[PDB]
């Protein structure tokens, strides 16, 4: 079902213009979608996780850290 | 400017239910989306390429080979 999931996540992440997707990958073997994202701050990552989850997606937000103007984290979408 | 790219590709690929996405990776450094797909036959991969291109996506279909019941190839979008 990692086809509606992709499209839905992409639409939700597009509703957060300050979020950038640096890398993204899925494998059938692993079973989920992993995204490396950057955002101006942690509140934006939390909101994005909230929006993905609200849309019905299983989402995990990895540990975030700040470097300069942005924070970065790994998102896992079921 | 590729969240819609991925979202659009997911919709087009979803219109080909016999195609399976085994792996998918994107990288901003690379600048495109690579997909490892399988399908029952080459005609399905060619139809999928045609549909992605028809939808307005830049698409390249790598060399395909058969193993057992399926063929496999690499798709590059963007």
Numbering used by the authors:
A (entry chain A), B (entry chain B): 304 to 381
Which of the paper's sentences describe this entry?
In our studies we have focused on the periplasmic segment of GspL (historically called XcpY) from P. aeruginosa, GspLperi, which consists of two domains: a membrane proximal domain (MPD) connected via a short linker to a ferredoxin-like domain (FLD). The inner-membrane bitopic protein GspL can be considered a central player in the T2SS because it appears to interact extensively with other components of the system. Even though the exact mode of secretion via T2SS has not been fully elucidated, the role of GspL is anticipated to help in linking adenosine triphosphate (ATP) hydrolysis to the assembly of the pseudopilus, which together constitute the two crucial steps in exoprotein transport. In this work we presented two distinct crystal structures of GspLfld, which in combination with the crystal structure of GspLfld from Vibrio parahaemolyticus, provide direct evidence for the conservation of a hydrophobic dimer interface.
In contrast to the dimer of GspLfld in crystal form 1 and the dimer of GspLfld from V. parahaemolyticus, crystal form 2 displays a full dimer in the crystal asymmetric unit. The different inter-strand distances between β1 and β1′ in P. aeruginosa GspLfld crystal forms result in two distinct conformations of the GspLfld dimer. The distance between the main chain atoms of β1 and β1′ of crystal form 1 is in the range of 4.5–5.0 Å and is drastically greater than the equivalent interdomain in crystal form 2, which are instead within hydrogen bonding distances (2.8–3.0 Å). In this regard, crystal form 2 and the V. parahaemolyticus crystal form of GspLfld appear as closed versions of the dimer whereas crystal form 1 exploits a novel conformation, resulting in an open variant of the interface. Notwithstanding complementation of the hydrophobic interface by extension of antiparallel β-sheet over two ferredoxin-like domains in cases of crystal form 2 and V. parahaemolyticus dimeric structure, crystal form 1 have adapted the open variant of dimer. A more indirect hint came from the necessity to model the two dimer interface residues Leu327 and Phe329 into two conformations for each residue, in crystal forms 1 and 2, respectively.
